[model samples]
Target: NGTVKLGYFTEWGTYDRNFNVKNLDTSGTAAKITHINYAFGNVTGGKCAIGDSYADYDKAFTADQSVSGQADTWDQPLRGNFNQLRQLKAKYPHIKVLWSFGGWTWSGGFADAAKDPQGFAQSCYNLVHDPRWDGVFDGIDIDWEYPNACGLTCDSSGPDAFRNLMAALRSTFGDELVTAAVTADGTPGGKIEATDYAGAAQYVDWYNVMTYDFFGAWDAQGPTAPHSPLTSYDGIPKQGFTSADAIAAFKAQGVPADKLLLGIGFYGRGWTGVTQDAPGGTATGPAAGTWEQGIEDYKVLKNTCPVTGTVAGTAYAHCGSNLWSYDTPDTIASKMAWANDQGLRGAFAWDFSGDTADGELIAALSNGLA
Candidate 1:
């Protein structure tokens, strides 16, 4: 069996990186990854100050938690990075590029927009198809954060709203391509679960189930769980909260097998309090993220943080006073193997900005999916 195709996030990672695509590891036998997401487009920067969380590059202040990191104008479309991405595309003709619109930060407006669906569709069409970068992008990816409920700080009118949004996006964008980075709610119903994913299936080309982020610093329990869990373990807090479980749940929801794409995070989701050395122990500190604590990339953490007891088949680690759950090359390879076995469409990453400077983790994705 062949590996699934791969895609990654670009905005924050690409800007923070000092290298170029020419430095990436495209060598090897991975499925020829055809896409890279260049982050958001905002109807908001024109509307508010937050810009678009996924694409706007720099949005002055982040959604809710802002203690000063990057500004909205740091490296925005307000400048001309999308064109730069277009330049990267020309250099890597084999890869397709798409602009992801709306994320947890910018999803607030959809509730109101879903009311007048046609107007919303028209605005989005104009934004993406802007004469500015006609040939720059191949398609669109929607990371609405959540459609029916809350994600981060934004929440909308439950299930039906999501279906309406997807239908509008699909109908407006047409079939050439319209994908979704969806919730990884694999359970019948759970805390991290989603409501009515099945109903939204008709409009999505690929439903990227974000199977990672199952557990992190937020849960003050002993050790933190890995971002991705392939199998259910004995003491697993929730019964159906693993990556595989999410996939099965999606399939059960009638989302066509080929339309489901799995999510993997290049960087780990970590906590800061840890007592034990490497393998096992209770957390001695706190869990943090780029936005929460200081930001870090795999290149820095690979050697710093390492884990034990392969949760659900992936690896994790505890370093200093921190606990981290992330995907290594081995984990990514396993995910690709599993996705192929499940007859799924492919795999996607949360944000491309999380990868290393030379596209190290992305290389693992390309090679594994190949």
Candidate 2:
């Protein structure tokens, strides 16, 4: 009746993020979210390969870090994130976990998988359903960067190839949940048009339409813009770059409203060396991030930079000369109202590590949707 909340739990978040699976519980995130996408299992050899065996299955969790408050023993067959997720599911029985493959770094492999879709599907199903982690995962998700388009790498898999690939997954997974995380590049004749997302929707239970990152510090120059906007406004960098337009594009493609999930990032993209506080200001370069150059986690920026002003249904601010745009609890409530009024299925954030210890942003999602 309200919303179906989902969040990604990046495996690497455990490292520099110091974000353990137990954080999901401690921060009250376990009860708020409906699904979790465990990110970055590799796609290699035209098969689903383990991205990091040590982090995925070998890294032991101490009692304090364990979801169940029980330390992992060497005698256990499964130990790392997968076991922690199993323990998480035990406590939050309503939550479902899906293993996601083919992120931007590894999406190039989808071209090879597209060559033999069924074989690729078989490989994925076998890995997802392996007895070693039987109850750890309820399904699988594909996070292809883009089909017949360019990302970190380029591809020529053809337009209908995406549909064919998805058909393979649906046929193999049968009753299991099969979802896809897709691009929301809404410029006319952009990434959305590069794939037959509508045709593929028939095979997918739902599509995680990344309704963010329309712009960022990637340009490294100027013309600052909100990375995610609920709706378009005057002077947007490009046409059709708003979440409203992207969702409209998907619906125009015949993808049902309920099968499209609105994406929210728990982090913000920024640019340094700016003049005006308003968007589209000339800048020097990317802003200093917690670890990277242009992006900072929301949890850090909430207190450090703070919000200056809001536009296009999101928030933006200037820390001295540096400008960053992000969504806060207040802004996300607005986004939730838009999502609900639009009849959208739900919303999901990029990751768990970027939120506050008490899960403030996700709590906004849970409450506002309710």
Candidate 3:
């Protein structure tokens, strides 16, 4: 099977979350994941740049925590996450690490990149292959929120702009994996319809369609829809916003099934002061989050507020006045079966840190695929 089990590793997690590359191995997550997307290298001046200097290549790791079991030297030129990732690749040769650029916050520079695709590619190639971290990254992943549409910031780059950018990336990184994270808006005239994703398929290996975030606290008083619904329900807030609709749309647009990876959110999106138990309910505002309001890791929600009901191929828990929607191991397994049935390449999670200490969600992903 060419199925890829991937997970995102946020560089910032090393600080507050204390999730380091070493956690992947200790938690047995590394064995299950085929790829690790080191996320959030900033897109600045139409090029890729380091998102965090200290976390990227400066933070010293103790011998016990170091991936290679060697303490970092104060005088060493290279260290931190990049060196640890290199050590991880040595241990798990099958795992490919890609440098992902332009996330929701850093995607503003992509418009500038669209103006000079070749230069952008050149900058990315040089940065990813920097002599300091030469073999750390196996490829580059363009995480443009939306190509020819609006995301955090709007981009009026024509529909063809996406294809042009992918073409330049493929040409610059020949034989290397070139991937992208794309929108999953499946409505009649939504984000998916705003771009030429089908046309860009030929230039990239696969697309990670963001199937999650279909609904969230952003809608303050929402119809209380599941953020990562797999199927359309009787009264979904929006038509064609389900994961199934997105997958069907991509296939309909002529993108190969094996080249599409369903995205899974390792966390839950919830709302507070909601009285209704079912999907459509009025909420006061954002729910309390472990880190940020309206969002919390699955690990925390799984225990703090046990699931009360199952709906829309996902689980929802009502603890007091709060209502949360997230995927449990059972739901994840079901989603994997759905992905396999659709001939999708595989599934990926928003991040590894969101999982429990024992790696419950990650294990579910691997065993489900198996």
Candidate 4:
């Protein structure tokens, strides 16, 4: 319990991913994880809103898939992922769940939220603490892509805007956990420098330092690089883009090391038609992935794109024309060791659904933290 072992559970995963709250219990993930960040609760019209009502609190579950081993009744008041999560909390009383609002796509609404901080905070409070799923969520997590900067859409909220919004949330939510997933762009004058994260740190219980996505096939051509590097390696595509750089930048900005949780990706991002076996290679285009073009789960890639080499405390596989980069259990354990060495709070993965059915990645984190 000393470490905050958290994982994100996407609300939409119930569809294509076939992931539900019950998977936490059945897959032995709930026992290992201390907190679950139920993701992508939208921020719309300057207020907090559910991303999908049916997937959130209306879809029913059978007895076998229910957390309590009881079937969801057709007449039940709450019957979807929210209801199942309520039951999950009942089964694993130690685990805390937080509703995360704003992500890559939905972060556009944060601009409106920035316009009226208090009003937005109150709206989020009412919705997250709604009586329908009483005690289901222990807190709220803000996952704005890059405050005062560009993401899927750009935001012109001034440097102090993030601090103001988080302060409002802290004031309204009282002692309940108020946290954020912040940008790890360590580049000088980058996303981290674009916001007053040091000032905003006081309002959050901790900052989930998104250390992954440093590089990817999003460029879609030439200059392939590892999407999540733990340290700087020779010929790295960009300087100051490693996870270590991000952590150091935040610490240097006056953020306490203990309040930073290193983020790990449970999936990999790859590029196709790669010609090099090491970092700083060139590629033709994005690689084929199950759910997306250049992104894939570790569970699938572990076998499909086996690790051919290691670099910067992570692993990569150069199989056929695809050059896939992701963290193996070995690399994740090493990362946890590094996090402990840095006196950080703990580590968390981008998601739980990306792990294998046997909970390989979650188990690595649990054991490593121990």
Q: For residue 17, give model 3's deviation from the true position in Å.
A: 1.6
**CA deviation > 4 Å runs, candidate 1:** 1-4, 14-32, 43-79, 154-156, 191-194, 221-223, 277-281, 287-291, 294-296, 307-309
What lDDT score is found at residue 87 in candidate 3? Answer: 89
RMSD of 3: 1.1
**lDDT per residue, candidate 2, 17-42, as tens digits?**
78999999999999889999999899
The sequence of per-residue lDDT tens digits that candidate 3 reaches over residues 258-354 is 8999898999999988978766898998889978888999889998878898888887889988899998899999999988888899999998888
**Candidate 4 minimal-lDDT segment of 10 residues:** 274-283
Q: How many clashes show up per model?
A: 29, 0, 0, 0
The local distance difference test score of each candidate is 0.62, 0.90, 0.90, 0.90
Clashing pairs in 2: none
| Whole-model alpha-carbon lDDT for candidate 3 | 0.90
Tens digit of per-residue lDDT, candidate 4, span 1-370? 2679999999998887888888888789998899999998999899998899999998888988778889989879888899988898888899999999999989988988899999999999999988888778999999998788999998888899899989999999998999999999989779999998999999999999999988888888858788889999986878999999999999999999878999999999999997877657788888999988999999899899999888898888899888999999999999889998999988898988899988989998888884
Q: Mark the regions of model 2 whose C-alpha exceeds 4 Å error after superposition.
A: none
Q: For candidate 2, which ten residues in a row score worst on lDDT?
A: 1-10
Per-residue C-alpha lDDT of model 1 across residues 1-370, encoded as one tens digit per residue: 2334555544553344532233333322112466666555544422212233333322243322221222235554532345445545655677666667777667766666767766676676666666755666676777777665567655646667667777777787785467767777656544234556677788876776778777765666555566677888775767787888888877776777888877877667666766655424576445655446423456567777655546677777766677677787887888778777888777876655556655656666666653
Candidate 4 ranges with C-alpha deviation above 4 Å: none
RMSD per prediction, one decimal? Answer: 6.6, 1.1, 1.1, 1.2
* After superposition, candidate 3 runs with Cα above 4 Å error: none
- Give each model a TM-score: 0.81, 0.98, 0.98, 0.98
